[PDB]
């Protein structure tokens, strides 16, 4: 049904990519509404701590309001795969930005932030090296963020989810792992490179007219000496970025694309389990 706090993208469920944001606090969406693309930048505020989802049944998942609202907004149904993989029988390799990439003929490749079909790319006259399926590095193929694994059809309307939280202790022992545990009900979502995390800088410089963004304190220490008359601003939370800084962090973002390894089924027991 219709969700109240569901500032929504225009191309929701129209076979085009979206970037539905999952931001803590109803205040942080105040920026998103004014900075959205108005085409693919849906959002849904969520305030609090989502309950531990690794000890309770699927049936009573919908009892929680926020979790059910996320399910309805993103369109996934619990217990079923979020996509339908299309079968393939070809494999190719190529070099991009000095890095070897293993791809399939029915896969999707992102170049400068735009996903292009492999069939279209092969028509652009760029060197593709065909290899046997038995020689395909499965781990390297699954660890590539510029390759999408042959989506055929999808009942899922918001193509990507861009989790975005605070950086202080209200971000560490916080929503971020609980939302990840909830999304873990769908292994295919992560390997597809869909569930993501936006990196809010921790320290922002104020040199000249522009600024410099430091996603870690260690990076700030390492590049401090090359900073002319820099001013220091600790971003210990989402509600500490001005509108312009949020606009830059949204339209030109850095994604912590979370991938789940074969050991995921243990780390969720050791943490929050």
């Amino acid at each position: 049904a219709k969700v109240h706090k569901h500032i929504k993208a225009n191309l929701c469920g129209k076979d085009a990519d979206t970037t539905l944001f999952l931001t803590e606090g109803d205040s942080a969406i105040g920026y998103l509404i004014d900075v959205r693309d108005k085409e693919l930048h849906g959002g849904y505020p969520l305030r609090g701590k989502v309950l531990n989802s690794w000890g309770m049944s699927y049936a009573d998942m919908l009892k929680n309001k926020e979790l059910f609202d996320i399910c309805a907004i993103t369109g996934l149904v619990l217990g079923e795969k979020a996509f339908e993989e299309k079968e393939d029988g070809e494999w190719f390799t190529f070099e991009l930005n000095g890095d070897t990439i293993i791809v399939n003929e029915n896969d999707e490749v992102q170049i400068n932030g735009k996903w292009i079909t492999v069939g279209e790319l092969r028509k652009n006259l760029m060197k593709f090296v065909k290899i046997d399926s038995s020689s395909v590095d499965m781990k390297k193929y699954k660890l590539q963020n510029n390759v999408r694994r042959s989506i055929k059809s999808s009942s899922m309307n918001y193509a990507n989810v861009a989790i975005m939280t605070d950086a202080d202790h209200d971000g560490l022992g916080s929503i971020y792992p609980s939302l990840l545990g909830f999304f873990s009900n769908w292994p295919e979502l992560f390997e597809q490179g869909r569930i993501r995390f936006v990196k809010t800088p921790v320290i922002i410089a104020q040199v000249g007219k522009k600024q410099e963004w430091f996603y870690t304190v260690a990076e700030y220490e390492s590049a401090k000496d090359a900073l002319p008359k820099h001013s220091i601003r600790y971003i210990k939370g989402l509600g500490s970025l001005e509108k312009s800084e949020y606009r830059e962090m949204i339209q030109n973002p850095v994604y912590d694309v979370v991938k789940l390894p074969e050991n995921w089924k243990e780390l969720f027991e050791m943490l929050m389990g």
Partner: protein, 442 residues
């Protein structure tokens, strides 16, 4: 040991007059002179306290709200946090006295971020308008370090717009534009006919019209197609969530339109698609009336101007022009206090600078010989002169580079400049010094 006879009547009498005194310090009605509610005055005083060192430094809102209790506030730091959050932003305030960095909300979503993330500082608006703070009335309660009220040049209560509910009393004031308020105050200063100030809500692109003494706030709409209309603005008190849930969602469930979100950086906006169920008459005026009725682009607000005068007594006003006429009369006295204290300070500074300059004129040629003496001997030897005696301690405890020729001319010119400033202050009145200070507001 001493035994009194206080009885029980005085027990209940003192139980009141203290709870009543407790509420009086916490009346939600804004003070007429400065427009500050009691909680807002403490937040502003704390922000000024944190800003003595660096005026442009941004301090945490939690830090600002945690220091009001030492200043005399009794109602916790939550109220100070909320007051600062509502003060710092620009969508809620035509003339915001706190400059904020962080998420202080917008018209679409009016909720600010957590107080520990968002920083706040006193804006250049405050320093351009809030003058003569050192001259403000000292509070009757000695525990109240913030003054009785601040001394803004123009009636900020009409600048930002105030709403409040008290025990048996209520206030509601519409935010009047800055330039119109400045013009009205200047007309009051010169004693001319005072115009009714124009109400202009902040971050509002719609229409405001006054009818039968009530201000009708109207949104603006343009028809994109026969069944599609593009609302460009909505009444002020709607934010996106409540507007949608109170108008768009119930009637969408009722099934006459399929609206969509079009809110952007340019304030509000909603593109609407009309269904066949909804009925649109061909008459332009009737269609306009029904649109502004069901979709709620029209709203009526009535001012109930209750303010607290310079005597701390609760007052009610029929119209804003009387409020401005009283405000200028009250502020004229404080500008006069500034005038008088400035006369005294300028006179003392002129005498001190003249004596300091004359020290050089005596020293350089042949008169005063500091070159070998006893300190107390020198003080006594120069204190016999009447013009030297008054400021001898400052006059002697004076730096070496002052005997150079350039510093000699500098001190002479500074003394002459202080004299011109003195005769300027002596030849000025309230009208000129208030009109001149009523020209930096922008």
């Amino acid at each position: 040991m001493q035994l009194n006879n206080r009885d029980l009547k005085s027990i209940i009498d003192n139980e009141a007059l203290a709870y009543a005194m407790y509420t009086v310090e916490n009346r939600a009605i804004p003070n007429m002179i400065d427009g500050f509610k009691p909680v807002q005055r403490f937040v502003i005083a704390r922000a000024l306290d944190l800003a003595r060192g660096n005026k442009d430094k941004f301090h945490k809102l939690a830090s600002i709200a945690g220091g009001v209790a030492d200043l005399g506030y009794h109602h916790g730091e939550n109220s100070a946090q909320d007051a600062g959050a509502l003060m710092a932003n620009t969508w809620n305030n035509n003339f915001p006295l706190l400059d904020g960095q962080g998420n202080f909300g917008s018209r679409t979503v009016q909720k600010a971020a957590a107080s520990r993330y968002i920083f706040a500082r006193v804006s250049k608006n405050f320093y351009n308008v809030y003058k003569d703070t050192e001259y403000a009335p000292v509070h009757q309660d000695k525990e109240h370090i913030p003054p009785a009220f601040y001394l803004p040049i123009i009636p900020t209560v009409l600048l930002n717009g105030v709403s409040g509910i008290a025990t048996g009393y209520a206030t509601y004031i519409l935010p009047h534009s800055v330039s119109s308020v400045k013009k009205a105050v200047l007309q009051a200063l010169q004693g001319k006919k005072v115009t009714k100030p124009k109400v202009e809500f902040p971050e509002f692109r719609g229409e405001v019209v006054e009818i039968d003494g009530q201000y009708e706030i109207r949104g603006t709409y343009k028809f994109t197609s026969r069944t599609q209309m593009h609302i460009t603005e909505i009444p002020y008190k709607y934010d996106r969530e409540t507007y949608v849930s109170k108008i768009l969602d119930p009637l969408e469930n009722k099934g006459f339109i399929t609206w969509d979100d079009a809110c952007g950086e340019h304030g509000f906006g909603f593109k609407v698609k009309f269904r066949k169920e909804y009925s649109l008459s061909d008459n332009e005026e009737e269609r306009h009336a029904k649109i502004m009725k069901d979709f709620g682009l029209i709203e009526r607000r009535s001012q109930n101007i209750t303010v607290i005068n310079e005597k701390g007594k609760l007052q009610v006003y029929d119209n804003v022009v009387d409020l401005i006429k009283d405000f200028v009369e009250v502020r004229k006295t404080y500008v006069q206090k500034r005038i008088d204290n400035k006369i005294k300070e300028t006179e003392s500074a002129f005498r001190l600078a003249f004596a300091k300059a004359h020290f050089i004129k005596k020293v350089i040629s042949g008169e005063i010989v500091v070159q070998g003496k006893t300190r107390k001997e020198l003080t006594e030897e120069l204190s016999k002169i009447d013009m030297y005696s008054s400021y001898v301690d400052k006059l002697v405890g004076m730096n070496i580079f002052h005997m150079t020729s350039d510093e000699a001319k500098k001190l002479a010119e500074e003394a002459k400049a202080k004299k011109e400033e003195n005769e300027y202050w002596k030849t000025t009145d309230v009208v000129t010094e208030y009109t001149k200070d009523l020209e930096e507001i922008k």
